[PDB]
Every structure is written in C-alpha cells, then in structure tokens.
RNA sequence: GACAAUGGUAGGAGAGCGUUCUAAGGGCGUUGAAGCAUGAUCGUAAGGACAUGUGGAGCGCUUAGAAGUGAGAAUGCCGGU
RNA sequence: UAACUUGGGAGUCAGAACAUGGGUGAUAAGGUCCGUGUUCGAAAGGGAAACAGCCCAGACCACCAGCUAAGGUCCCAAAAU
RNA sequence: GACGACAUUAGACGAAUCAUCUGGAAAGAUGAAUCAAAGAAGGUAAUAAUCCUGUAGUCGAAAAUGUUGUCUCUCUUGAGUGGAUCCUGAGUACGACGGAGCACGUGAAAUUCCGUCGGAAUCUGGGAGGACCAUCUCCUAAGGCUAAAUACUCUCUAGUGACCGAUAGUGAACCAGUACCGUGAGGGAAAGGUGAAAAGCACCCCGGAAGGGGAGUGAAAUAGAACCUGAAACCGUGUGCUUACAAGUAGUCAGAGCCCGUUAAUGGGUGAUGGCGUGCCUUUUGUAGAAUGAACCGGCGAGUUACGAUUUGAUGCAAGGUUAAGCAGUAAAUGUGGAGCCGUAGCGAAAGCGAGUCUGAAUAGGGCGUUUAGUAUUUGGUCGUAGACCCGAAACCAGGUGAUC
C-alpha cells in the first residue's frame, strides 16, 4: 500500500519545510484580555515535527 | 537455500573439551560444564600471573632477611645501607647469591654495614 | 577509431569507429551494477515454505494449561515442534529492479570499449549454410569464447550454436553479460555501424 | 571485467545488521529489559496520552489554477509562444508568465495571464499580449 | 621516529571470520574425495592448514552476489542414554 | 579543551548505601521524603578477619624488575620483639 | 444438415573412437582421431558428445475426438419525403415514513433499491447536470439477450528452479490419512539406503537351538542382512602415574619425584605439597544465593518479506530528471511507450496577486517566501500498513457431534 495521510491535515498547514498554525484558544468565552486576544500568528512545535511527522508528509 | 547447522558444532565443541584434559569426573567430557570451568580458568591466570609477582617478591625477601638475621641485620637496616651505599640491584639475585655462594653475600654486608 | 576489415584472412579496407561509442573510456561501477541487475534478474523465486498457518495441523490444546508439570504449549505445530512451521521462512518476490535507460547504454558501450581497450575485430559475413565448418573459419585465432555477431534474423548460423564456446545474436540486443565473459568478440562490417549509431 | 575482477565502490554496501545473534555483536537483546520490546513494538503510531496535537480548523480548498514562467528566458528571439514546453514548462492547466531577472532580447508573446513588471518590459522589449 | 589514549552493562558507530548455494576463472580427486578420529602446529580472536588412521566418491581455492546463515538455558519438541 | 545548531538512531522514567543541611517519625530504624557530593549500579585490584556502596586507586597485553599510596611490621602473614 | 485442411490420443528413423598405465571394474591421466540442425539429460562395475537410452531435425494415424475452411444449407427487401391524425412500456415515476446501499454515518444530501401508504404527464411531454427554482446543454426509464479482453486450477501433457534432500520438504519418499486414541464429530504417528552383480556364507567344529570360530563368494563381510559412512552421552576390559591424619565450585600458579619421546619445541603424561579462590544465565537497589530454569549429550529452533515514506552513501544526468501499464522480445537488462510524477515561485482560509504577498487605514510595522540544485535507481539505518522478534493464556462467536455414564 501507499501510506495513508493522517486528515488532521487541515489544522496544520505547510510552507518551506515546516507547519503552520493557528493558536489554540478560541471560540468560547471571550471576556478575557484584550493582549491575550490578540492571538493570530504562528505557532510550531519545533522539536516534534521528530515527533508529528512520516504521518503527514504528502503535504510536507 | 536452508542450512544445515551441523558439521561446526561438535568441531566447536571439540575445540573446547580438549582444553580440558585432567579435570574431574563429568567434567572433562560434557560440552557445557567444561566450557564455564575453562572460562573460570582464564580468568585464574589472569590473576595468578599478577600473583606470582607477588609472591616471588615475598619469597626472595624472606630469604634475604634468614641471611642477614646471621650478623642480627634485621632486612630494613640492609637496603637503607644499600641506597646510601650509591648501588643498587634486584632481588632474586641477593637470593641466590646468599644461597650459592654466602662469602660475596658477607661482603655485601660488609659495603653496607659501614654506610651506617 | 579505425579498425582493419577483413575477410577469412585478408585484410581490407579499414572503418570509422565513433570515439563516443569505442573511446567511451569504460566505467567499472555502472558496469558492476549493471551485471548485477541482469544476474538477479534469471533468478525466478520458485521457493515456499509452510508457516504455522497453512500447515495441515492443529489448533488442539494437548494437554490442559496447568496442573500437569510441564510447560505450556498451545499447538502440536509451531517452530519448535518437530513437524511445525517454519517462521520468518522465505516466500517468492519480483528478484528485479531497475535502472535508468541512459546508465544501461553507458554499460555497453564501456564494455564495448573495454574490447576495443585491447583487441575487437570484424568482418563481412554472408555465409549462408549450416555446418561446423564455421570453426575452421577460426583461423582468424578469434580465441574461444566469442559473440558473432549478425543483423537482424539470420536462420543459417544461429542453428551453429552447438559448438562448446560462443554465442551468436543479433545486435537487436547485446548484453553486458553476453560480452563480459569471453575478451574475444568479432561483428559484421554492416552491422557495427549500426550499433555505433544505435548506441 | 571477465567476471573473476570484480571489485565494486567504496560506500556502495555494507553490512547487515542482523540480530537475535551474538553477545559481543554489539546484539542479543537490543531494545530494554522487560520494558516495552514486545512483539507489537508501538506507542500507537503518535500518542503520548493525551491531546495536545488538538488545534482548530482554519480551512477551505476549492479548485485553483495558474502555471508559472518567468520572463528570464534567453532561448528564443522571435517564436511566439504555446508552441513550446521545451525550455519551458512541460504542463500547463493554465498558463501564466512573470518575471525573474529581465529578458533584453526583443520576443513577442502569446500568453494566457501577465505579470505587471512582465507587462511593463515586454511592452519595452516587442510586445505584450493576452491571448 | 615521537606524543597521547585504549574497564565497561543498556546502547550507537566501524572493520572482520566461517557455512550453503550460484556465476565466472583456475585447480584436486581410486596412484583414495567428503566426513570422522588423533596430534606436542599457524593466526590477536572468531578460525584455518598439515601428517597419520578409518573411510569408498565427489570437493576445494580467488573475486563478487543471495541467504531458511550460527544455539548452553524457552517448567522448550524429538531421539537416545 | 571543550561549548552550540541541524539531521539520523536508541536506551532510561523501581534506584541503594556513606557523609552532609533539613522535614516527618520517638534528637528509633539497613526507615521514608528532598537538596548537596562521592562511590556501587556499568569497575575489577590492595585494606576493612570474611563482605556491592566505607578507605587508597581507575586493569591494552606479557616479564622471576623497581618506588610508593591507604593500611601495617612477634607467629599465622612480607616487613622494626 | 453435407464436404476438405490442421492439432491431439500408440510410434520410427535418428552422425561419430581406438590403444597404454592404474584398477576388481574405466567412461580418468597419457596420446593420437571423428560428428555436430544433435556438447540437453540420465544410466552404463569409477567423472563418457563418439557404449545404451537419448536429443537437433525429419516422418507417421486404420479408428476416434477437437478446432478450423467451401458449397451445400437456411433465412431475408432496402431507403426517402410529408408529419393532419394516433403511438411511444401505470397503481409505474415521484413524495412522505422507517431502512439499506452508493467512499458518503441523515447530514443541506442528490443519484439508486427495499416495505407500508398516497399518487403524475403523454413531445408545446419527461429525467439529469450533488438541496431547490430559472435559462442553457445533454438523454428518453417503468421489457429482454449478448462473444472477447478478465479471475482460478481437483486434473493432464511438456518444461523450469542461486527450492527441500529424510527431526526439512505434502502429515505422508517406505503398503499412511495407516497402526493408534476416542462412543463420535475428530486428532494423529515413528520407519529410506548391503554390494557393481545375490555371487545372500557349500563344508567342518561346539551347541538343544540361537549364536559363534573356521573354510569359502566378493577388491573389502570390523559391508553378512537390526547389512554405506558410524561421532557424543553411556558402559567396560587392561594398563603408565597416583591415592587410605583427611576438609576439597574441584581449577589455576609455583613445583620435586616416576615415565615417555613430538606437526621436534622455552616438550609431553601423572602430580606429593603450598599460595589463591563461594558455578552459569535470567531478573535485580543488590544474588555464592536458601529466588528462578536446565538430568547428560545429538538434532531442531527467534527481527524476515512486499508496498510506501524518510534519511544516509554511491552512481547517471542537470534547470532539468523520469517513466507506468501495454506491444515485440530466451518466463530474459532493452528497445519502444511522454497519459502521469517531482522540481523550476511563493503567500493567502479563498477569490486572487505574484519576488512579493498577507495582515491591515497605512506605502508603517511585522509572519512567511527571495537569495537555485534538484531528481530516477539502489546498498544500509528507521518507521507504517499486513500475525510482522518467538513461544504462551482464561475467554468470545458461527456451525455441527454426543442422554450407551
Ligand atoms: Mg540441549
Ligand atoms: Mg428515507
Ligand atoms: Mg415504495
Ligand atoms: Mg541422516
Ligand atoms: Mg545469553
Ligand atoms: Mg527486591
Ligand atoms: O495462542
Ligand atoms: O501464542
């Protein structure tokens, strides 16, 4: 067979050798703070793309 | 292609037991029991050899010292004069000449005695 | 690049030789895989083995799990049981793989130099018939092992195989392990163009 | 070579390495004591226990598009294009030329979709177009 | 020629020996093969030659390739004692 | 003379004693729980009568050479009655 | 329904060598010779192209079968225009309700099928084009048949193997699904080899016989039927050395005495006596361990393979690289085959824009991308999917066998 792609593909998009994100909380209580709402950037989890990886590598 | 182990086992096996020419009962025949007593066997000459060196140093002392109890020169007395006396040797040579020859052993002393 | 055409032992006029085909200045490593690439594609994987599976035998627990004194066993056929499966045994495979089509025509055009590299002849043949008398056509001294190589289908020297030592294709293919065994092979006035040509 | 010669690469093998032999192979039991070396051998293809590769979708893909090319060509002079996908692309679900250090020699065009600074140069040099 | 290092389980890296078979080359064999047995021999090791006896027909060696490739222990299977 | 990054591969998640600052406990435990350091674990050898951890000290191999460490010098057991 | 060709089921022909030595016997060594459309293979007293069977090639079927062919043989009208009027598959299609299946879990869920119930149209018609309406485009259910390409091999013919060669391989090489076990379903064994030829021990002797010593067959009977080779355990017979005040994980080191002479070298066999010294693996904070396993020895027996990803090394090409199936081809590397795949430009959820994009009022500020080396094959390392280092459970489920206890 061919290897399947883990289809917790859509959360973690690629660009040059590496993933893409977006953070983590959101979508209930937004109350809380102004800074801790200003949430939209990167993220990575650098040391376990040893870890998060030969699952989804079609798309890396 | 299957292989057939055979035909390297018993030459093995050969190979050990007769290493084990004069040892007692089952045990220089059995493949096994032969093998761990000759490997406690190595091991014993790798300690032995350090052993005799030992030894061998014991021995040849305590000759020296039955020498030079004859003119009450206890053995520390002698090889304190020997260092002072600007000679020096082995042992095992003040052994066997006190034991072959004792005049060349007097006069030894005699070199010795008079740097104290 | 040029050799002296012959013919049963006269000389003739001479050829041209492309430098690209015999001047190719052989390659060992090409050469090696190349070999091994053909040598282990004869190799059909008729063998087969039984597992614990396939194995006419026995699922019967034949004594009881506990309470007996000796161990614990589950089947009368397994590795260890005389009779038993044989485990991680082998089973048939493709026994071939592949190599780019430009490597290959390296391969032979070096150990078509690697002839050259010493000693590669040549003649014109139209010798139509069927006997051994292509031996005393030796004379030439085209030492034992050869290749005789021809165009496309010839039915005449091709049923002269049966001599002890040589070969005969045409050069629709020619292969690095036909040539590599024997260091004296011959080819055809008409023919070697073509192959230089070819490649 | 006559097949009794051989002598291959430095780097091209090795050995293999088996195992479930030896004592002094560097082998004999070669993962843990006791510890998780059973037959199955998996932590589960990616699991700690727990759920910290958890994150939202942010997500949509529906049908796209272009090709590329650059304009740094210096192949042809005047030889009009869709011709071609020598020393260019080999497939095209849609054409699109850019740019990529500039073309000086004079070339028309032929071309689904255009760059801007493309445009701008190939308007300098012979042409621009859109077809 | 100097200088320095060289205990070591889990474990990582490297170089290596021998078996069965294949391909090629070159060799041995009733003027006694293989295996077996004996031996006070060579190599740093795994191992290999040699002499002799028995044995009564196939085997080695160099280069490389593929392996069902090595067994002291499973309250292990079988067989014999 | 090591330090850092990247990439490939693992192992480990039950630790113990001695000294030491402390909690708990009875200023009990070869106790338990933490910090600190060593050794054992993965390291033999000499001393501690005998001994995994205490003390001196880190084995590449061989020698019938020597000097020292801890600890010892009447016999056992080499060395100063 | 008649009538020819081809293949199949028995077969035949089928080129070529002599001698010397060894030998019990040559097919070997030694020499000189031969055929080859046949040097494939096996047997022949030891290893044979030229001794036999045989092969290459060629020939051959009374009868039967099978497939093919040509006359018989049957059976047949084929188009075009015009479209006044009629026909174009009814309790069907469709809807709802519950369900299944379509890669699709009721989801916005099309399209298809099942059951209950309701219930259309008639070419200016109807269905689809992934809820649903419109325009456009395409097609015409609700009746039926259909070769090849494909999947498999109980079996036969001819062949083959970097397949096994008697604890392997079919469980089964031999009188095996047997003996045997069980009421029964059912489960299931061990066991090959004389020599070239049976020439398989006439005859004498002891002995009740068996068995043996002799004599003979044979090169060899220590090849004599439980018969090639015949190891180790285990058991004995004799003998060089040694042993009866002695505390022994059994050895090692030192070493006298007694004896012997080698793959001829710092020799070998024994060993009074002394020093030193608590087995092996596993598991363990640590084991002489009174924690576990092994009675001995022989054999057997555990990280394998495909597909794919990834990196490492090599190798060929290079801003290029590469083929897949299939066709021809010795079951073959070897040629074809450019659909496809990677890369060459990225960012953005996306429309999109494009060496800049996105965010954003911003041209600010920042995240990402810039500045070319990639890629096909492969050895090795590792992972995943398949039982996937090996052995080991109670248990679960479908189907069936037993109330002779
Ligand atoms: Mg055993
Ligand atoms: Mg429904
Ligand atoms: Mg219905
Ligand atoms: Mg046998
Ligand atoms: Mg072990
Ligand atoms: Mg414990
Ligand atoms: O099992
Ligand atoms: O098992």
Do not use: C
């Not at chain 1, 949430?39 to 989804?56: T, Y």
């Not at chain 2, 050969?14 to 040892?23: C, E, Q």
């Not at chain 2, 002698?78 to 006069?107: C, P, V």
């Amino acid at each position: 067979p061919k290897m399947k792609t883990h289809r917790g593909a859509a959360k973690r998009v690629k660009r040059t050798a590496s993933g893409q994100l977006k953070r983590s909380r959101a979508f209930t209580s937004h109350l809380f703070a102004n800074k801790s709402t200003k949430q939209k950037r990167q993220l990575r989890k650098a040391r376990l793309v040893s870890k998060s990886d030969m699952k989804r590598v079609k798309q890396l | 292609p299957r292989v057939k182990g055979g035909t390297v086992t018993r030459a093995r096996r050969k190979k050990t037991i007769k290493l084990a020419k004069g040892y007692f009962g089952s045990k220089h025949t059995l493949y096994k029991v032969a093998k761990q007593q000759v490997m406690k066997s190595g091991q014993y000459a790798f300690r032995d050899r350090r052993q005799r060196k030992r030894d061998f140093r014991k021995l040849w002392i305590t000759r020296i010292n039955a020498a030079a109890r004859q003119h009450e020169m206890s053995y520390s007395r002698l090889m304190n004069g020997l260092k002072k006396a600007g000679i020096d040797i082995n042992r095992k040579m003040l052994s066997e000449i006190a034991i072959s020859d004792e005049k060349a052993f007097a006069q030894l002393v005699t070199k010795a005695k008079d740097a104290l | 690049n040029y050799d002296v055409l012959k013919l049963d032992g006269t000389k003739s006029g001479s050829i041209e030789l492309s430098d690209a085909v015999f001047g190719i200045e052989p390659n060992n490593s090409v050469l090696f895989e190349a070999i091994n690439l053909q040598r282990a594609s004869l190799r059909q994987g008729t063998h087969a083995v039984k597992n614990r599976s396939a194995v006419s035998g026995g699922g019967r627990k034949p004594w009881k799990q506990k309470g007996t004194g000796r161990a614990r066993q589950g089947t009368i056929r397994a590795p260890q049981w005389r009779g038993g499966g044989i485990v991680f045994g082998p089973t048939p495979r493709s026994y071939a793989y592949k190599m780019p089509k430009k490597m290959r025509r390296l391969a032979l055009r070096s150990a078509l130099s690697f002839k050259a590299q010493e000693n590669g002849l040549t003649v014109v043949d139209a010798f139509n018939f069927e006997a051994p008398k292509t031996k005393e056509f030796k004379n030439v001294l085209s030492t034992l092992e050869q290749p005789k190589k021809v165009l496309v289908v010839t039915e005449n020297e091709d049923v002269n195989v049966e001599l002890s030592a040589r070969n005969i294709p045409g050069v629709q293919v020619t292969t690095a392990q036909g040539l590599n065994v024997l260091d004296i092979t011959n080819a055809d006035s008409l023919v070697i163009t073509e192959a230089a040509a070819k490649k | 070579m006559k097949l009794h010669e051989l002598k291959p690469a430095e780097g091209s093998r090795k050995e293999r390495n088996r195992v479930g032999r030896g004592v002094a192979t560097g082998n004999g039991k070669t993962s843990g004591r006791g510890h998780k070396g059973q037959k199955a051998r998996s932590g589960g293809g990616v699991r700690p226990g727990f759920e910290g590769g958890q994150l939202p979708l942010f997500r949509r893909l529906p049908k796209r598009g272009f090709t590329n090319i650059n304009r740094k060509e210096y192949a042809i002079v005047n030889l009009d294009q869709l011709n071609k996908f020598e020393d260019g692309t080999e497939v095209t679900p849609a054409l699109l030329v850019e740019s990529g250090v500039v073309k000086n020699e004079k070339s028309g065009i032929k071309i689904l979709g255009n760059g801007s600074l493309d445009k701008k140069l190939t308007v300098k040099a012979h042409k621009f177009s859109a077809s």
